[model samples]
Target: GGYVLGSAMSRPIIHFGSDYEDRYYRENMHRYPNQVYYRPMDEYSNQNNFVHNCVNITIKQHTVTTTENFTETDVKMMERVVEQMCITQYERESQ
Candidate 1:
């Protein structure tokens, strides 16, 4: 019914866009530890349909130092967080 869009370990600037360039430089740009960004597809017609309930998730790079320490457990946990968040977002959008 749902699937992970993609996962990558990279700096925020690379994923976040050029708008963050100035701030990144000013703030001494740093990477996050674990981040997930999700969005529901607009092609869905029926809200109750499993196939219609499509979404995408981007798991960004976590902290540079903590990245190497991340394990499968941590990755699964992040996915869980995204799943819950997606559900919440879908519910709110439907309303």
Candidate 2:
């Protein structure tokens, strides 16, 4: 799911297909897109086959014109599950 322009992109960083096992891959790919790739889950998981990682799409607003390659494991979004919340309590106390 892509996001509206000027929206902040917040999602998983590295999509390690090399992480999950075969069964996990089959199940997830059916749900995710093709451009979606996978890499080893990393030291996070020492043993596994591979799995489909969801690399999303999000667009940000900027004055300058620019372009760049979207890493195979990258998200620009997942708007389908977005929320707007206001935190009243905080430790960073500048409010």
Candidate 3:
């Protein structure tokens, strides 16, 4: 429940998590029987903007190491910002 405009809803449920956490949900969370752990978001709008995998490596008989990557979601955001810039540029050019 985020935003509710006139006769419409705009709730962007973007899950922000670290690499360890995201991969954890995608990997270990589905080990139980009858447990719906990971659900694939292959919807049209969310197809190219979802991060299916993140970075995480387990050390030799030790703790887990993690890092970040330029995910699809990040590229999606960059596209959005760049598109907005282009839109504004076009608007300004016409004026």
Candidate 4:
């Protein structure tokens, strides 16, 4: 997972998760964004109809912006939020 400083949008956009779930999550981070979006992927199974060790997870992206300029601390916090969310989802699926 990584982040990009948008050129056209002029906002910080974060990208994470696997390549399968092509959708992006918006407003998933309630603290920073007005809404939060997330995708839960389907389970993968083998030809023998056995469930593999795959995890049900989502690919997410957050478009971050504020009325005021973003400070270094704000950016760091955003990263932390993203990381925390991803970890939580992964752990939930692992259970």
Candidate 5:
């Protein structure tokens, strides 16, 4: 459902466990309720910033992950985070 009155739909494709270390991510990454499971975010500058891997937003146009506004370490850590989540998030995804 797109937005209204100047709003639009959006779909931010997720990677399934890319930003598990980020506080913002860890605190609000996984889905819940009717949408349970591990959902990764490639918001980091290292990876997960692709244009063809976003979700279906409902109020944002050109929804994608490409901030490129993070520090070098942050980007590196993002890679590490994805590596770690890779082996674990599989469970969340299978569920």
Candidate 6:
């Protein structure tokens, strides 16, 4: 869920296991190739501004490059990778 705003990477920025609880998701974001993340925050705040803190659901995809050509087997393997990741054709197509 990384993006460049106005040409530079200075922009908004997870949760899992941490002091803030979000540290788990934020800190481990670099370990995955394709996935989306989400965490919700609640309010018991001292302010009365009627503000809500929220985060977006982000899909993280791998940055891939290839200098070599792919053979038929390679193509099949790529498909297999998706399958192994538990993403079925029906699931992908619907999305």
lDDT of 5 by residue, 1-95 (tens): 22222112121223435464445444433321112112244223222322222222210222233424455544444443433433233333342
> Candidate 4's residue-wise lDDT over 1-95, tens digit each?
12222112112344456432112223333334222223233112221111111111111334322216345544454554444444343344343
> On residues 1-95, what C-alpha lDDT tens digit does candidate 3 reach at each position?
11111121222222336775445434532221111111132222232221121000001111222325435544443333333332333233232
Candidate 4 at residue 3, lDDT?
A: 22
> For candidate 2, lDDT tens digit of each residue in 3-70?
22222233222233465533443343333222222232221322222111111221121112233533
Clashes of each: 4, 12, 0, 5, 13, 2
* lDDT scores in order: 0.38, 0.23, 0.26, 0.32, 0.31, 0.27
Give the poorly placed runs of model 2, Cα more than 4 Å off: 1-20, 35-95
The alpha-carbon lDDT assigned to residue 56 of candidate 6 equals 18
RMSD of 6: 16.5
- Residue 49, candidate 6: Cα error in Å is 43
* 5-27: candidate 1 lDDT, tens digit per residue: 33433333222245554454334
Which of the two candidates, 1 or 5, achieves a greater lDDT against the reference? 1
C-alpha RMSD values across all candidates = 11.0, 16.3, 18.0, 14.7, 12.9, 16.5
Q: Which predicted model would earn the best lDDT?
A: 1
TM-score (all chains, Cα) for each model: 0.38, 0.17, 0.28, 0.34, 0.28, 0.22
Q: Best candidate per TM-score, number?
A: 1
Model 4 regions more than 4 Å off: 1-39, 42-60, 64-69
User: Residue 52: error of model 3 in Å?
Assistant: 28
Cα lDDT of model 6 by residue, 24-46, tens digit? 33453333323222221212221
Candidate 2's displacement at residue 23, Å, is: 1.9
- The Cα RMSD in angstroms, rounded to one decimal, for candidate 5 relative to the true structure is 12.9
In angstroms, how far off is 68's CA in candidate 3?
5.7
